[PDB]
Design a protein around this motif. Structure first.
Motif, short mmCIF file in Angstrom:
data_model
loop_
_atom_site.label_atom_id
_atom_site.label_comp_id
_atom_site.label_asym_id
_atom_site.label_seq_id
_atom_site.Cartn_x
_atom_site.Cartn_y
_atom_site.Cartn_z
N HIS A 185 44.65 40.18 40.41
CA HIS A 185 45.14 38.93 41.06
C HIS A 185 44.35 38.67 42.32
CE1 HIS A 185 49.02 39.68 38.89
NE2 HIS A 185 49.03 38.34 38.80
N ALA B 262 40.75 37.71 41.71
CA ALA B 262 40.71 36.35 41.13
C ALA B 262 40.76 35.32 42.23
CB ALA B 262 41.84 36.15 40.15
N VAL C 72 36.31 41.74 39.67
CA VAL C 72 37.01 41.30 38.41
C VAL C 72 36.50 42.09 37.21
CG1 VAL C 72 37.29 39.29 36.80
CG2 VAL C 72 37.82 39.09 39.23
N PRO D 216 46.23 36.27 36.82
CA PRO D 216 44.92 36.08 37.44
C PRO D 216 44.28 34.75 37.07
CG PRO D 216 45.17 38.36 36.71
CD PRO D 216 46.38 37.60 36.19
#
Length: 373
Positions: free
Chosen positions: A223, A226, A234, A254
């Motif tokens: 999260h 992102a 990521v 996300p």
């Protein structure tokens, strides 16, 4: 003192009070604060912050600070405080509680930004955010120091239980210790993911940090990465088994945060790794709702190209076309129609996208929507 060492590092104006102790004394005051107020630590430590109050300190404003301590809440105010020599200064002052694992209040953090009397609107609002972020920076440094102290203290109890041959209590304390260490690793990984510290993320994972660990609000490293646009982080988290579809307590994923923040490359990577294109948050928002609301045309295009439900309804009956019509995003309205958007959808209050285009004076959009009727 782990806590003392952690707080001396912060070059900001703040104090820490202990509300468990009678009269809620200051137990730490930053060099910066002492400089501002013209006191020494010997003068301040162990005393209630009310020495800052003088005749022109607004009593209704002090009341709001008192209420915030009594309710264990946050407040930000502006007010006149006093130096040792009776000089006045304006400051934005932010108070928040710092809670223990049980979530009981252990400390209050107070942050002052001085010289604020000419700040208005947007500029003042930036100061209010700055004092909050400082309090958050202090709270994270303090949380880590308190974890290290708990680790030091359990290791002391283990050594003691070994010396009494209490083998059951050693095993019990060793489980507790293994959990403090897991907690420290996820605290560090969340922060590294947020700050975009790639090598620090790699190292925390090598040391056994849970790629699926979550904070209070079920926020995962993925999260945070992102939101902050950290493409490499990521990819690292996904390769090491991060749940691409993890929902936080608000059901945010996300992909929602990537769409919310305009991060196209991250939207594409999450989708490629099997992100749910139609995940709905607790409000019934999908990524496509967020992409449309914030005007992210290329993300709207990529979500639809990946099979997004073009007519998803949030808990107010808004579809992506209602939002794009409402907020004046002509090309997104054009794209949404080509993908099967329903011009006759009515939200909870009886409005079609055409109705919202009209009510918002979005002329071009009202034409295009009329033409599609």
């Amino acid at each position: 003192g782990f806590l003392e060492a952690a707080l001396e590092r912060i070059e900001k104006n703040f104090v820490i009070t202990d509300p468990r102790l009678p009269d809620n004394p200051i137990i730490f005051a930053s060099d910066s604060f002492l400089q501002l107020t013209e006191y020494s630590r010997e003068e301040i430590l162990g005393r209630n912050a009310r020495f800052l109050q003088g005749p022109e300190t607004d009593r209704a404003t002090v009341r709001k600070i008192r209420d915030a301590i009594d309710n264990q809440t946050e407040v930000t105010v502006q007010l006149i405080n006093y130096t040792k020599s009776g000089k006045k200064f304006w400051n934005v002052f932010h108070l928040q509680p710092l809670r223990d694992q049980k979530g009981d209040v252990q400390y209050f953090i107070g942050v002052q930004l001085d010289g604020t009397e000419h700040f208005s609107g947007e500029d003042l609002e930036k100061l209010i955010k700055e004092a909050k972020q400082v309090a958050e920076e202090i709270a994270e440094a303090a949380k880590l120091a308190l974890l290290k102290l708990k680790i030091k203290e359990i290791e002391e109890k283990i050594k003691k239980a070994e010396d009494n041959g209490d083998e059951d209590k050693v095993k019990e304390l060793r489980e507790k210790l293994d959990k403090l260490r897991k907690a420290y690793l996820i605290l560090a990984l969340l922060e590294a993911a947020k700050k975009g510290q790639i090598e620090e993320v790699r190292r925390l994972l090598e040391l056994g940090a849970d790629a699926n660990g979550a904070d209070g609000g079920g926020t995962t490293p993925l999260h945070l990465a992102a939101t902050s646009g950290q493409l490499t982080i990521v990819e690292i988290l996904l390769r090491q088994g991060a749940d691409v579809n993890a929902a936080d307590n608000t059901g945010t994923t996300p992909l929602h945060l990537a769409a919310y923040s305009g991060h196209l490359e991250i939207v594409e990577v999450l989708l490629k790794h099997g992100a749910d294109v139609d995940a709905s948050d607790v409000f019934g928002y999908t990524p496509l709702h967020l992409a449309a609301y914030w005007g992210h045309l290329e993300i709207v295009e990529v979500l639809l190209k990946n099979g997004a439900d073009v007519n998803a309804m949030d808990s107010d009956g808004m579809t992506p076309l209602h939002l794009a019509a409402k907020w004046g995003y002509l090309e997104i309205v054009e794209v949404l129609l080509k993908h099967g958007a329903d011009v006759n959808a009515q939200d909870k209050f009886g409005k079609t996208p055409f109705d919202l285009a009209i009510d918002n004076g979005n002329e071009d959009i009202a034409e295009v929507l009329q033409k599609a009727a």
